[PDB]
């Protein structure tokens, strides 16, 4: 639908693409060297239709983390096994302020911030160890991305577990106020936590995974239905709010997309019923934000009217 | 669009109207007598689609305040004349957490609670005096309304201000922060402020104004261009994060419209390119929702998927 | 006690004081220009002991504006005439954090910050008029004194009214949450309150009231007592913990001497059944207490080993 | 000093002991069975004056945890053997509000809160291991108590350990924002802090070492110098403020004596240049203070003017 000639739409994307390129400020995430090794001049950008019509531009076949970018896919994944209720038995569905901390009912503010994600992450494929809980969340995101490539960096992951003090604190903060369901090894559950962090993917195989959140839970390139539509919807409405770090609420004024950023330079969009799209380029702004990623975002509502109020 | 049968859709709203009538809980506000007269068992609920369909069922013809609804309707005057970037070098673009204060800017965080409202409230028509500023709104009402009903409550004008040591308090604090133009009369201003609030509607008349943010900013009735249309995506933003004071967050994620409530009992709702609507009952819950218009709005969303990310 | 030779004393306060004036760092305070015309140079330091012996040293007859150093002084007043009971069901006993807002129990943290003093301000000499509590007021600060010089600065009071936006936001507030008496006319004490403000004094007259709260309420140069018991150990114990703004913390910890500072540049100091002392000078460092003040604090105590616990 | 009779002073002692007796009120700490373990009727004061003179009533002879009373203790012993500008820079100097947090120089409010207790806990004896290190600061117990009962609990230590989450999130918070000295095994300093949370002692050993920090250091049953009086008076003016959890604002307004409680239920009480204290009795109120611990402290002010500033 509101295209209508991908040909056209697509000149379109190349234009934005060519004029973020210009876009060089930022600094590269440098906590571990797995993300300092990237260079700053890596762009890519990768869309996937609901149709199925695909276009790249730039560098999207260059593998890298998923980082945060993997928070709403996980929790897209325990509403769809667990239903909405359940879930939000233990995080929140909203916004908070700025820190570390539980909102009013001692539960983490929502699913985008890390205590929201850590506790998730401890929801799903409960009773199982952490060897099968990882094979059923890469099956997962093979359906999402319709099987195209889902990798995992062992580097990442080792660094990732070996400095994350502040994720460990979160930890034992959640034992401490009973945010993890009876029987928890919390410990575990960070284990987990780090090596979903550190799945691979591309911008080509990425923005079929926008898309499927995109084409209300079907991946548009093989029709299979993924995720339930309850688990969309929700995860669209904390993508919209929560997605964007601390630049959430001003992206959501004047940007209006579902979108999830993450420190490795990506930033997922969700353009529903239309398009999925994924934007990375390592080079991070004062938010944690991909500088290319934000500027082509702008660039991209202020031209086809995609503002979810446009 | 998406309707498509206006006649069986009717039925199903009296449906929801008379569900959420079994609803007897909340409380009157009573802060001021003009609030406090009011009758706990009164329901009104009025739709009026993009053409110009209407329909009415309950006391939808019995006057009240905007009160805070009125909210959105003068930020929307102000973008409207003024333009996005000036509007915002004096208020924020975004919800915050749970009190008196300002952001990182020193700036109200948005036109949806008082001390945002009081700003936005001094920016539009600058210079002439109060009658002339409080005849030029009700001249845009008006337009919005369609020429619907839209009055003037004197003794809830003269209650809000002889009884608002909060909203003077928060007058004289953003003066101290230089939070208005240069050369403003603070004092002059929450007067005006106080006026607004005191301005009376209809279900009726008011379900034509939310009409018209969702048809582009067109009156439905009369064809005509009230509003631009940067100033009706900026409001409909706005009202979708920070249109239900505290429960804007779970509005947002279970009903996903935007909206605004009032202490009067009032909910502006909005369905993008559909249907402006008004729900009042004076009864409101902790949150200062009306809690039939709270549990209308969901049953609504929860039976025609109008859920933003349906 | 302890001295036990005032000469040398007196000694080693010229040198101590000497050598605080080489520090010329600060800036005056300028929001009003009443405040703005003194000079950076002036220096001040003025004792009187528990007997009556006197010592001065640099500009200690210029006559200056208590400011703040009022603060606990009309707390004292307070407790004096309505006993700990009663003045404290309307403000706090304890130092806060950094801002405007009361404690868990809607009521100023202490009577040391402006809130605070606002509402002590409301409770004395209740239902006579401004002349008369004013009068009133004097007439207490002269006992203290032993009748040296207490003036009063009209300039100061008219500005600081004129300019006090931010006093006044207190005002409304406090009377929102209801912290004042019944039948309180607010704007009243505010105006009572920046009167309090601009009354005069000279480090001479200044040091006879420390000495009189150093000599357990008896003024040392006339005898006669001033203040109850209970009034003195609890203006003691709060000028300990909130007497110099947001360096109370590391006064206490480094001085251990209760003491109160003022914009003025003043420094209302206390050595327990020793001494009393008024340090003046108009340069303020970012804390808001006088630079030399600061620096021959520490001198004092670091050499005549006055600290509460040494 | 100020006494003058011993002999009658004791009478009053043990007239106050009765007096709380009847206090009956309190929860036995229980988030372990050592604490849960103790009989809400348990019920000691002992007292050791500057010379040496002794008296007891009650259970003073059954040992009990200090936990949170050997904070003071450790720091003082930091102080002592490191100065005050080397520890200091990693530990603040007051009180804060109400959370787990830094200040605004990213370090633990002071050595009394738990995020402090343990920063002072890495200082110490740094180098060697944790059996020498633990062996050092009995020494140091040793000496302040004059060689009376000093003690170790493991199970309370086993417990402790293995149920302290909140602590352990404290550890890898201060981890992350690096609070520690370099080269810090951060897990090897918890179970230090347990361990030194462990250390049992009885009344009257324990009011011995509150009678050396009397007695500027020195221990009033052997004349032997323990700690240095730069570490006296900061371990004091730190327990006059700090010492009493959230309750340490209205102890130091109304009783006004340097004091540490513990969740064992004892309260390491401080008169200068007087007496030492140790009162224990495992029922606590909502603030975590022995009921009749705060009660009688109360008695004992409003008897013996023994107030800072009587
Ligand atoms: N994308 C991110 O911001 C995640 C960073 C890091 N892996 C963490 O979990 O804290
Ligand atoms: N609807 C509202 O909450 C407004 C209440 C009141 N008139 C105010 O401005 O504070
Ligand atoms: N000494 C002071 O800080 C007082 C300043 C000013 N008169 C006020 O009351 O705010
Ligand atoms: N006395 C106390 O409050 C200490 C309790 C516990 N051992 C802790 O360190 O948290």
Chains 1, 2, 3, 4 share one sequence.
């Not at 490539?149 to 992951?157: L, P, Q």
């Not at 929560?242 to 992206?251: E, P, R």
């Not at 944690?288 to 979810?308: A, E, M, R, T, Y």
Request: some cysteine; charged content about 20%.
């Amino acid at each position: 639908s509101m295209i209508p000639d991908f040909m056209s739409f697509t000149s379109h994307i190349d234009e934005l693409y060519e004029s973020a390129k210009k876009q060089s400020g930022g600094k590269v995430a440098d906590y571990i060297p797995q993300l300092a090794k990237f260079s700053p001049d890596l762009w890519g950008v990768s869309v996937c239709t609901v149709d199925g019509q695909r276009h790249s531009t730039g560098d999207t076949k260059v593998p890298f983390c998923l980082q945060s970018c993997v928070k709403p896919l996980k929790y897209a994944i325990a509403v769809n096994d667990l239903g909405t209720e359940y879930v939000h038995r233990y995080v929140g569905k909203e916004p908070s302020g700025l820190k570390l901390f539980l909102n009013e009912d001692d539960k983490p503010h929502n699913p985008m911030v890390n205590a929201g994600a850590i506790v998730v992450t401890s929801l799903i494929k409960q009773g199982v160890n952490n060897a099968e809980k990882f094979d059923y969340v890469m099956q997962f995101l093979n359906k999402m991305a319709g099987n195209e490539y889902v990798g995992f960096s062992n580097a990442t992951f080792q660094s990732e577990r070996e400095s994350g003090d502040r994720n460990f604190a979160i930890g034992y903060y959640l034992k401490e106020k009973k945010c993890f369901p009876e029987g928890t090894d919390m410990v575990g559950i960070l284990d987990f936590y780090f090596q979903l962090c550190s799945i691979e993917v591309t911008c080509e195989s990425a923005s079929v995974m926008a898309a499927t959140l995109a084409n209300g839970g079907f991946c548009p390139i093989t029709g299979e239905r993924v995720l339930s539509p309850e688990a969309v919807r929700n995860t669209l409405s904390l993508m919209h709010s929560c997605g964007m770090y601390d630049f959430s609420g001003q992206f959501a004024f004047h940007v209006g997309l579902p979108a999830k950023s993450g420190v490795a330079g990506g930033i997922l969009l969700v353009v529903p019923n239309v398009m999925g799209m994924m934007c990375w380029s390592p080079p991070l702004d004062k938010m944690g934000n991909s500088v290319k990623g934000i500027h082509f975002c702008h660039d991209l509502v202020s031209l086809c009217n995609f503002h979810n109020y446009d």
